[PDB]
Amino acid sequence: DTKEQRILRYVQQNAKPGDPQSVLEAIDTYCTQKEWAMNVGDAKGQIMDAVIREYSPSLVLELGAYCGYSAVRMARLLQPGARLLTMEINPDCAAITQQMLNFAGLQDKVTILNGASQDLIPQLKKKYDVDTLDMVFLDHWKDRYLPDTLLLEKCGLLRKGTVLLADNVIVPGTPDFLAYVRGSSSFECTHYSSYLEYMKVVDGLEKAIYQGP
Ligand SMILES: C[C@H](C[C@H]1O[C@@H](n2cnc3c(N)ncnc32)[C@H](O)[C@@H]1O)NC(=O)c1cc(-c2ccc(F)cc2)cc(O)c1O
Ligand SMILES: [Cl-]
Ligand SMILES: [Cl-]
Ligand SMILES: [Mg+2]
């Protein structure tokens, strides 16, 4: 089996069904003590929590679900009736994410789509009945942050106030995306310095609020 399968099994055997916080704790324990994995982690995850609570978004889009850690993290703080859509290109990881959400009891709040963000984004309006997004969490391939931001705008999915929150802007790094949003009058940016998940290595989140054209 794979690392991701081991993580899922660990959660199933060390967390409480229907208890998202126990799921996050289980994943953090496994990744600290057993095998590292690219979940956003507790350090950055606390910042994410603070952002989600500030904005109380009704519709969030996540790019790059992996095992569902961040989807659990965000969805557990959404208000009743609010929704998360998350995309994952790797079919094995999409199935793990689905099962992780099911175990957490969040499956009614979250739709996990198996596919590439650049193919699925242009379908959101006609196929998934999306008007505009309140928040976007970018955590997929780092060289796709910029192209998919531009794609989101082209598709009419951003509104005044939409919050983009980007993981890994320092490690592995997303230098084109950071230069772009920081230099654009269409975004208001804030940098939240933190640490790479499960590691004593500096990383950060960037928040970029869309201001319109
Ligand atoms: C990119 C991955 C996260 C997931 O993104 C999905 N994905 C891809 N492209 C697409 C698409 N176009 N559409 C949808 N899903 C998509 C994929 O299949 C992964 O499951 N994340 C990382 O590689 C990542 C790596 C590190 C990292 C840091 C220090 C190191 F020494 C080594 C690795 C830390 C992090 O925090 C990460 O987030
Ligand atoms: Cl994650
Ligand atoms: Cl951490
Ligand atoms: Mg990441």
UniProtKB/Swiss-Prot annotation:
Function text: Catalyzes the O-methylation, and thereby the inactivation, of catecholamine neurotransmitters and catechol hormones. Also shortens the biological half-lives of certain neuroactive drugs, like L-DOPA, alpha-methyl DOPA and isoproterenol.
Domain of life: Eukaryota
Native source organism of the sequence: Rattus norvegicus (Rat)
Keyword vocabulary terms for this entry: Catecholamine metabolism, Cell membrane, Cytoplasm, Lipid metabolism, Magnesium, Membrane, Metal-binding, Methyltransferase, Neurotransmitter degradation, Phosphoprotein, S-adenosyl-L-methionine, Signal-anchor, Transferase, Transmembrane, Transmembrane helix
Interval of the full protein contained in this chain: 46 to 258 of 264
Residues binding substrate: K142, N168, E197
Protein family per UniProt: Belongs to the class I-like SAM-binding methyltransferase superfamily. Cation-dependent O-methyltransferase family.
Keyword Repeat: no
PTM annotation, UniProt: The N-terminus is blocked.
Catalysis performed (reactions): a catechol + S-adenosyl-L-methionine = a guaiacol + S-adenosyl-L-homocysteine + H(+); 2-hydroxyestrone + S-adenosyl-L-methionine = 2-hydroxy-3-methoxy-estrone + S-adenosyl-L-homocysteine + H(+); 4-hydroxyestrone + S-adenosyl-L-methionine = 4-methoxyestrone + S-adenosyl-L-homocysteine + H(+); 2-hydroxyestrone + S-adenosyl-L-methionine = 2-methoxyestrone + S-adenosyl-L-homocysteine + H(+)
Required co-factors: Mg(2+)
GO BP, one annotated term: learning
Amino acids binding Mg(2+): D139, D167, N168
Transferase recorded as keyword: yes
CC annotations in GO: axon; cell body; cytosol; dendrite; dendritic spine; glutamatergic synapse; membrane; postsynapse
Protein name, as recorded: Catechol O-methyltransferase
Primary enzyme class: transferase
Residues that bind S-adenosyl-L-methionine: V40, E62, S70, E88, I89, G115, A116, S117, Q118, D139
Topological domains annotated Extracellular: 1-213
Signal sequence annotation: none
UniProt cofactor note: Binds 1 Mg(2+) ion per subunit.
Molecular-function annotations in GO: catechol O-methyltransferase activity; magnesium ion binding
The enzyme's E.C. designation: 2.1.1.6
